[PDB]
Amino acid sequence: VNYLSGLGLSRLICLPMALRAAIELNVFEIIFQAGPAQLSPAEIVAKIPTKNPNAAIALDRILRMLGASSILSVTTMKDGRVYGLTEESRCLVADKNGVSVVPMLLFTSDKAVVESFYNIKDVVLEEGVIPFDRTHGMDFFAYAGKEQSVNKSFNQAMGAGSTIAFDEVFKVYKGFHDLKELVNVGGGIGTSLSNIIFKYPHIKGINFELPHVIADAPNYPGVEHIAGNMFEGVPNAQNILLKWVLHDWDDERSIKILQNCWKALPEGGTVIVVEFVLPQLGNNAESFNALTPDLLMMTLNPGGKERTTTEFDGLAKAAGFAETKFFPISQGLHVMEFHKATA
Amino acid sequence: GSHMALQEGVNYLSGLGLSRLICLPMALRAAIELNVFEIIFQAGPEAQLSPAEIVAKIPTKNPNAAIALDRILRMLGASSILSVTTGRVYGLTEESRCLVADKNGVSVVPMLLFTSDKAVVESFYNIKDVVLEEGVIPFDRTHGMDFFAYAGKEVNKSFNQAMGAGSTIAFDEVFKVYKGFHDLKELVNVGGGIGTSLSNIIFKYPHIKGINFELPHVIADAPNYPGVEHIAGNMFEGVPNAQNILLKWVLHDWDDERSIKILQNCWKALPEGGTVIVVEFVLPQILGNNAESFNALTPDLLMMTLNPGGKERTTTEFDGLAKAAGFAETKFFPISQGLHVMEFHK
Ligand SMILES: Nc1ncnc2c1ncn2[C@@H]1O[C@H](CSCC[C@H](N)C(=O)O)[C@@H](O)[C@H]1O
Ligand SMILES: Nc1ncnc2c1ncn2[C@@H]1O[C@H](CSCC[C@H](N)C(=O)O)[C@@H](O)[C@H]1O
Ligand SMILES: COc1cc2c(cc1O)[C@@H]1Cc3ccc(OC)c(O)c3CN1CC2
Numbered sequence: 187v188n189y190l191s192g193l194g195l196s197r198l199i200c201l202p203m204a205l206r207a208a209i210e211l212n213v214f215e216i217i218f219q220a221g222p223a224q225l226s227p228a229e230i231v232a233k234i235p236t237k238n239p240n241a242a243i244a245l246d247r248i249l250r251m252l253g254a255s256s257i258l259s260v261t262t263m264k265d266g267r268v269y270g271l272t273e274e275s276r277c278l279v280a281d282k283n284g285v286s287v288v289p290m291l292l293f294t295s296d297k298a299v300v301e302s303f304y305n306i307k308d309v310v311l312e313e314g315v316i317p318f319d320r321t322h323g324m325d326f327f328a329y330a331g332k333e334q335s336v337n338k339s340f341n342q343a344m345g346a347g348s349t350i351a352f353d354e355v356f357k358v359y360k361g362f363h364d365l366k367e368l369v370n371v372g373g374g375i376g377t378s379l380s381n382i383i384f385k386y387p388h389i390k391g392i393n394f395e396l397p398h399v400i401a402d403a404p405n406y407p408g409v410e411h412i413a414g415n416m417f418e419g420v421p422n423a424q425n426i427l428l429k430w431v432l433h434d435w436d437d438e439r440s441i442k443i444l445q446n447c448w449k450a451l452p453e454g455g456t457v458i459v460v461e462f463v464l465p466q467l468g469n470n471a472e473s474f475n476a477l478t479p480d481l482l483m484m485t486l487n488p489g490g491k492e493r494t495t496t497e498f499d500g501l502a503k504a505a506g507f508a509e510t511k512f513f514p515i516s517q518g519l520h521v522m523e524f525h526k527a528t529a
Numbered sequence: 530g531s532h533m534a535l536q537e538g539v540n541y542l543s544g545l546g547l548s549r550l551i552c553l554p555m556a557l558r559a560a561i562e563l564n565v566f567e568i569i570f571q572a573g574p575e576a577q578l579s580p581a582e583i584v585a586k587i588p589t590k591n592p593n594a595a596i597a598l599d600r601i602l603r604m605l606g607a608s609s610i611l612s613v614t615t616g617r618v619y620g621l622t623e624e625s626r627c628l629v630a631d632k633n634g635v636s637v638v639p640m641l642l643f644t645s646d647k648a649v650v651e652s653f654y655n656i657k658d659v660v661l662e663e664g665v666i667p668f669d670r671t672h673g674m675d676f677f678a679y680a681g682k683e684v685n686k687s688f689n690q691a692m693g694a695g696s697t698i699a700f701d702e703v704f705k706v707y708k709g710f711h712d713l714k715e716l717v718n719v720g721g722g723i724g725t726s727l728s729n730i731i732f733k734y735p736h737i738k739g740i741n742f743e744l745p746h747v748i749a750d751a752p753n754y755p756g757v758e759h760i761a762g763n764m765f766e767g768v769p770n771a772q773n774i775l776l777k778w779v780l781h782d783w784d785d786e787r788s789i790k791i792l793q794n795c796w797k798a799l800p801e802g803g804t805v806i807v808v809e810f811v812l813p814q815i816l817g818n819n820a821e822s823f824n825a826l827t828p829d830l831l832m833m834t835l836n837p838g839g840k841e842r843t844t845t846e847f848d849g850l851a852k853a854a855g856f857a858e859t860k861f862f863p864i865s866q867g868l869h870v871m872e873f874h875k
C-alpha cells in the first residue's frame with residue numbers, strides 16, 4: 187500500500203482554502219484583465235493592495251497548488267511560473283452584469299458553515315440533530331437574522347446563483363410565457379424575479395420573504411416585497427415560484443409549504459419548482475451538482491436534502507397537485523410544474 | 530464588449546460545483562471519525578457494504594443513520610475516494626486503502642485528522658495575510674500564539690500522533706532504499722517528536738543508541754521505546770553532544786535564517802566526522818498533477834499557514850542551507866515520490 191502518497195490526501199483540505207485565498211485576493215479578475223495571457227505572481231501582485239516585498243513569493247505558493255490541481259493553467263518562463271485562466275476557472279470571473287460563482291464559493295466555505303461541518307457525523311450518530319444548530323445554538327435562518335456577515339454572504343450567494351440558474355433555465359424552459367403574475371415564496375433578495383421579468387416584461391413579481399432578507403435587498407422596481415412566514419401562509423397568488431426552498435426542508439415541512447401554496451393559488455394555478463435533482467452517480471458535473479448542495483443541506487438545514495424526480499412527484503401529489511411535469515434544464519438542474527387543475 | 534464577451538456563455542452553473550472542494554474534506558473527516566474505512570476493510574477489501582451494513586458496526590440507535598451515512602459516502606464515491614454501486618454499496622479504492630491500519634496499527638488517519646483540525650482550518654482563513662502583510666503567520670494571527678507554543682499550552686496530541694504515524698510510514702519507505710544508518714552507534718533526533726522515528730530506526734538497527742531531543746510538552750507524551758531516551762530542550766539554544774543527528778520534518782518548519790541556526794547548533798554538537806541526516810520531501814522545480822508535486826505542495830501550504838516562515842525546498846536550497854551552516858559535503862538519496870534522505874557532512 188502506498189501509505190506515503192496517501193499522506194497527500196491532506197491536499198483535499200488545502201485546495202479549497204488556497205482557492206478561497208486566491209478569490210479573496212482578486213486573482214482571477216486580475217488575470218482576466220490581461221486578455222484571453224498568463225501572469226506571473228509578481229505581475230498579479232502589481233494589482234493587489236500590499237506593501238509586502240515578499241507578497242509575490244507567498245502568492246506563488248498559493249497559486250502553484252491551484253495550478254497543479256488544474257484550476258489555473260501554469261507554465262514556467264524565464265521569471266518563474268505564470269498563471270492563466272482555464273475552462274474551469276472562467277466561472278470565477280464576473281460577467282457583463284457582474285455575476286460569477288464567487289459569492290457562492292465564499293458562502294459555502296464561510297467559517298460558520300465550515301465550523302458546522304465538523305459535526306456532520308452527528309446526523310449519523312444522533313436522531314434529529316442539525317449540525318449548524320448544535321454548533322451555533324440556533325438554526326441557520328435565525329442565525330442569518332442575527333449575524334449580518336452571514337446574512338449578506340448567503341443572500342449574495344443565492345442571488346448570484348439565481349442569475350446563473352435562470353440564464354440556464356431560459357435556454358430550455360418556456361413555461362413562464364403567458365403568465366401574468368408570479369409570487370416567489372422564499373424568493374431571496376428578489377434576483378430570481380428580476381431575471382424572470384427581464385425576460386417576460388408583463389409578469390408582475392411579488393417576492394415573499396423573511397424581513398432580514400428584504401431589508402438586504404436592492405430596490406428592484408417591478409419586484410414588490412412582502413414579509414411573511416411561508417409555514418403560516420402564502421399571499422394569494424396566480425402562480426408561485428419555489429426555487430431552492432423545498433430542498434431546505436424535510437418531507438413533512440416541504441409538504442406543508444406546498445399545501446400553503448395550493449391554498450393560495452386559484453384553479454389552474456401552478457407552482458414552478460427550480461431545483462437540482464439527484465442523478466441516476468459518478469465523477470461528473472450532474473452528480474456533483476446534486477451532491478454538493480445535499481451535503482450543505484445536511485450540515486445547515488432542518489432535514490433538508492436533495493431529491494429524485496420521483497420524490498418531488500411524491501411531494502407534489504401529497505400536497506394536492508395531481509398534475510406534474512418535469513423539465514430537465516442542464517447538468518441536473520430541473521424546472522418542475524405542479525399544476526392545480528382547472529374545472 | 531468583445532473583452533467581456535469572454536464571460537458570455539461560461540458554464541457558471543457547473544462552476545457552482547466548485548463548492549464540492551470544501552465539502553469533500555469534511556465528508557472525509559466525518560467518514561474517518563465514524564471508522565468507515567476499517568469497517569469496510571473488515572469485509573475483505575474489494576467487497577462492498579451498504580450504509581446499513583456499515584452503520585450496523587457503528588454505535589448508534591438512530592434509525593435514520595444509514596440514509597445519513599449514505600449521504601456522506603456517496604460524495605466520497607463520486608470523488609473516487611470510495612467505490613460505489615447501486616441501495617448503494619461502498620468499497621475501498623487505491624486512494625482509500627491508506628486509511629486502513631497496517632499490521633502495526635499505523636495508517637495515514639492521524640495525519641488527515643490533524644491537517645483538517647479546527648485550529649488548522651481556522652488558521653487557513655488567514656493564509657492571504659502572508660501575501661498582504663509582511664511577517665504575519667496565519668496561525669499566530671488567528672490564535673494569538675505560535676504553533677509549537679500553542680501545542681505547549683494545548684492539540685499537542687493530534688499533531689504528535691500525526692507526526693508519529695507519518696514517521697512510521699516514511700521510514701518504512703526509507704529502509705527500502707537508504708542504508709546509511711547501518712554503521713552508526715548513536716543518533717540524536719533533534720525535534721524528534723514522540724520518538725517514533727528513533728523507535729523505527731532502532732527496530733531495524735538495534736545497536737543504535739537513540740536520543741530524542743524535544744520540547745518538554747512533546748516528551749510528556751512519549752512512549753517508552755527501547756533504546757530511546759528522551760531529553761527536553763530548545764534546539765535554538767543548543768543540541769546535546771551527538772555522534773550523528775537526525776533532522777526529519779524540522780527544517781521545512783522554518784525560514785532560511787532559523788534553519789541555518791538549527792544546523793549550526795547541530796554542527797557545534799557534532800564531532801569532526803559526524804553527520805546530520807535530513808529527511809524531507811523535496812519541492813520539484815517543474816510542478817504538475819503528479820504525486821511528487823502534491824507531496825511537496827501539500828505540506829508547503831500547511832507550513833505557510835502554521836509555521837514561522839517554513840517552506841518546502843529544492844535540493845539546491847537544501848545544499849545552500851548546509852553550506853551556510855558549515856557543512857561542506859552533502860549527499861542526496863531519493864527515496865520515493867519526492868521523499869529524500871540527505872546527508873550533511875561536517
Ligand atoms: N418561514 C419562511 N418563510 C419565508 N421564507 C423563508 C422561510 N424560511 C426560510 N425562508 C427563506 O428561504 C430562502 C431559501 S434560499 C433560496 C433563495 C432564493 N429562492 C433563490 O433561489 O436564490 C431564504 O432566502 C430564506 O430567507
Ligand atoms: N525549539 C525547538 N527545540 C526542539 N524541538 C522543537 C523546537 N521547536 C519545534 N520543535 C519540534 O519540532 C518538531 C517538528 S514536527 C517533526 C517531528 C518528528 N521529527 C517527525 O518527523 O515526525 C515538533 O515535534 C516540535 O515539537
Ligand atoms: C504528502 O502529504 C503530507 C506530507 C507532509 C505532511 C503532511 C502531509 O499530508 C506533514 C504536515 C506538517 C504540518 C505541520 C508541521 O509542523 C507544524 C509539520 O512538521 C508537518 C510535517 N509534514 C511532513 C510532510
Ligand SMILES: COc1cc2c(cc1O)[C@@H]1Cc3ccc(OC)c(O)c3CN1CC2
Pocket residue numbers: 290294326347430431434462474475476478479482483486487542543544545546547548549
Ligand atoms: C452545484 O453547486 C451548488 C448548487 C447549489 C448550491 C450550492 C452549490 O455550490 C446552494 C447551496 C445552499 C446552501 C444553503 C441554502 O439554504 C440554507 C440553500 O438554499 C442553498 C441552495 N443551493 C442551490 C444548489
